[PDB]
Amino acid sequence: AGKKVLIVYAHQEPKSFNGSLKNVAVDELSRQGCTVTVSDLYAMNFEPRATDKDITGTLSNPEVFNYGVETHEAYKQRSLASDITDEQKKVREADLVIFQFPLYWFSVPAILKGWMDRVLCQGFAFDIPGFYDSGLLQGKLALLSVTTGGTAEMYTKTGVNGDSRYFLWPLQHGTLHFCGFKVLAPQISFAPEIASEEERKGMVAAWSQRLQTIWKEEPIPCTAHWHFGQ
Amino acid sequence: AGKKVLIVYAHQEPKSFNGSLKNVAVDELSRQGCTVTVSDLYAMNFEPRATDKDITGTLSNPEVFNYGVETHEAYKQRSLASDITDEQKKVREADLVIFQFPLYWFSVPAILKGWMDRVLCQGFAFDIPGFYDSGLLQGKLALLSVTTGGTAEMYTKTGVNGDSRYFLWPLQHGTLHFCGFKVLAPQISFAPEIASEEERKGMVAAWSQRLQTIWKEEPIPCTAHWHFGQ
Numbered sequence: 001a002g003k004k005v006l007i008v009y010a011h012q013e014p015k016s017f018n019g020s021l022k023n024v025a026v027d028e029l030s031r032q033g034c035t036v037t038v039s040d041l042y043a044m045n046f047e048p049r050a051t052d053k054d055i056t057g058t059l060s061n062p063e064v065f066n067y068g069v070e071t072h073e074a075y076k077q078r079s080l081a082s083d084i085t086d087e088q089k090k091v092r093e094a095d096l097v098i099f100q101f102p103l104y105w106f107s108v109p110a111i112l113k114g115w116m117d118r119v120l121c122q123g124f125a126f127d128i129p130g131f132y133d134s135g136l137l138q139g140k141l142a143l144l145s146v147t148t149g150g151t152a153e154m155y156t157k158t159g160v161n162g163d164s165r166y167f168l169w170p171l172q173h174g175t176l177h178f179c180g181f182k183v184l185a186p187q188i189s190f191a192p193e194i195a196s197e198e199e200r201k202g203m204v205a206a207w208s209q210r211l212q213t214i215w216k217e218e219p220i221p222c223t224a225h226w227h228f229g230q
Numbered sequence: 231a232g233k234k235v236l237i238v239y240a241h242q243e244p245k246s247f248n249g250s251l252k253n254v255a256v257d258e259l260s261r262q263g264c265t266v267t268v269s270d271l272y273a274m275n276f277e278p279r280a281t282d283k284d285i286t287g288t289l290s291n292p293e294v295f296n297y298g299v300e301t302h303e304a305y306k307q308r309s310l311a312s313d314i315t316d317e318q319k320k321v322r323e324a325d326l327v328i329f330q331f332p333l334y335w336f337s338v339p340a341i342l343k344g345w346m347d348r349v350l351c352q353g354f355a356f357d358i359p360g361f362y363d364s365g366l367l368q369g370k371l372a373l374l375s376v377t378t379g380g381t382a383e384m385y386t387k388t389g390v391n392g393d394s395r396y397f398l399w400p401l402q403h404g405t406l407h408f409c410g411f412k413v414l415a416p417q418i419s420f421a422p423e424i425a426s427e428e429e430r431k432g433m434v435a436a437w438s439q440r441l442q443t444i445w446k447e448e449p450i451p452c453t454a455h456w457h458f459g460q
């Protein structure tokens with residue numbers, strides 16, 4: 001063993017279904033003997049905005065502000081804001097990063113989008129070269145554990161929302177694969193708010209049970225075909 | 231014939247390529263006689279986080295906080311935070327909403343994601359029923375004006391990033407169409423950083439030129455087929 005996990009958790013309410021999925025993950029991975037860390041973004045009041053406050057000391061170009069260039073240079077020069085570098089250390093140490101969130105507008109809640117925007121800077125998460133298969137977080141696993149308002153049936157190719165895989169593309173491919181993660185199959189807990197107690201319990205147990213064997217999983221082929229093909 | 235436009239703008243730097251695209255839109259729509267409003271999110275320090283500070287009234291359930299439920303009720307009761315209702319007024323009055331932003335992780339910058347999350351609440355933007363074609367913002371047009379780091383070639387079906395339309399899905403369909411907007415074709419200004427100065431000037435002029443006839447355009451068919459093909 002000796003496996004290290006970071007859970008990046010984005011829900012306001014400890015008693016929520018998301019909260020329970022997060023807690024079951026902590027419980028089960030802790031039981032296994034894994035090293036576990038949680039970034040509870042709302043509790044941390046995590047800053048989502050990409051601004052010039054993310055660089056400490058003198059800017060590379062104080063007259064014209066380019067977030068990408070400034071953060072790349074700040075990473076190289078150990079001059080990023082401590083909230084960012086605190087998260088980078090957690091990611092650097094992790095073998096697996098689990099994202100636990102409710103689907104907001106076919107994507108992550110803004111607080112979690114901000115974590116992605118600000119934490120995954122050039123030089124840390126990807127570079128030229130070093131992206132997609134050679135992304136700098138290569139060797140690590142990532143997994144999206146998402147809850148939805150809509151039902152499984154709505155998230156079908158011919159359903160009103162389209163296939164759930166369609167909304168996964170920017171997250172799994174554009175973000176996680178880009179940074180070199182192997183992407184484990186998403187955990188999608190459909191429509192807990194209208195599910196029965198029994199069904200909800202089932203979904204939480206599926207997740208806990210899945211976690212028992214998470215280290216034996218094969219990553220998905222994070223391709224356009226997987227997301228969009230038949 | 232008396233058209234109102236809201237530009238929701240998400241860039242930190244007034245001298246940026248995004249800044250120029252926003253300014254030329256203001257100039258050209260102003261020249262046409264349109265009524266124009268801009269929400270400059272970074273300059274506004276717009277709050278992106280969905281939190282219980284977004285409701286000031288008595289909560290429906292003060293023991294277990296459900297953001298969707300509480301904001302829906304707060305919208306009906308008029309106890310939403312005023313920054314949200316300020317944006318809703320701008321949207322309510324607009325005939326066309328243009329979003330001007332750099333692509334961040336195949337999506338919008340977090341500050342703009344937060345605008346979507348917080349402003350487009352139930353009761354205001356959609357109801358149950360009252361979504362997709364019957365969304366509450368029906369009759370309005372929306373348009374994504376996006377800039378990218380990657381080139382046009384990279385954003386094709388056989389390119390490393392996949393086709394550009396793939397990443398539009400959560401924004402155009404999952405968000406805008408869901409709220410009832412008709413969606414005008416996106417403006418994607420590819421890779422301005424790589425482009426020559428002449429090519430950049432060309433991209434800005436192309437947007438201004440397109441705006442001259444924007445009111446004659448038809449919306450796209452905002453469907454899975456449009457985004458993903460056969």
Ligand SMILES: Cc1cc2nc3c(=O)[nH]c(=O)nc-3n(C[C@H](O)[C@H](O)[C@H](O)COP(=O)(O)OP(=O)(O)OC[C@H]3O[C@@H](n4cnc5c(N)ncnc54)[C@H](O)[C@@H]3O)c2cc1C
Pocket residue numbers: 011013015016017018019020101102103104105106107147148149150151192193197200201204280296297298347348404
């Ligand atoms: C801004 C915004 C945008 C949204 N966009 C979308 C979208 O694009 N697409 C979409 O489909 N949905 C969308 N939604 C809906 C959203 O995804 C769901 O509301 C969310 O996923 C529900 O998860 P939750 O943890 O908040 O559920 P909760 O309301 O916290 O949980 C549901 C029920 O499960 C119960 N529960 C908690 N723990 C357990 C347990 N251990 N065992 C059994 N029951 C338990 C809870 O008590 C509760 O009764 C959006 C919502 C918002 C606010």
Ligand SMILES: Cc1cc2nc3c(=O)[nH]c(=O)nc-3n(C[C@H](O)[C@H](O)[C@H](O)COP(=O)(O)OP(=O)(O)OC[C@H]3O[C@@H](n4cnc5c(N)ncnc54)[C@H](O)[C@@H]3O)c2cc1C
Pocket residue numbers: 050066067068117118174241245246247248249250331332333334335336337377378379380381422423427430431434
């Ligand atoms: C957190 C983050 C995530 C990102 N994710 C992605 C992603 O998923 N996919 C992707 O492809 N890219 C991504 N990028 C790259 C990003 O999308 C580009 O950096 C951005 O789109 C560039 O637009 P800009 O306005 O910042 O360019 P600028 O750097 O401001 O513009 C380039 C040049 O244009 C010049 N200029 C300004 N106005 C004019 C004018 N009127 N005429 C001529 N020249 C002018 C500027 O002076 C500058 O020299 C990401 C960047 C960041 C920081």
Ligand SMILES: COc1cc(N[C@@H](C)CCCN)c2ncccc2c1
Pocket residue numbers: 105148149150161191193194298350351352404408
């Ligand atoms: C595109 O689908 C949704 C669904 C939402 N919420 C519903 C499903 C209630 C949760 C289950 N009872 C959304 N809520 C807010 C904003 C966008 C939504 C989109």
Ligand SMILES: COc1cc(N[C@@H](C)CCCN)c2ncccc2c1
Pocket residue numbers: 068120121122174175178335336378379380381391423
């Ligand atoms: C986190 O930043 C990026 C940048 C990308 N593209 C390069 C070309 C940026 C160039 C502008 N300086 C991405 N491309 C694809 C997917 C994610 C990206 C993230």
Ligand SMILES: [Zn+2]
Pocket residue numbers: 172173174177178221222223224
């Ligand atoms: Zn991929």
Ligand SMILES: [Zn+2]
Pocket residue numbers: 402403404407408451452453
């Ligand atoms: Zn659509």
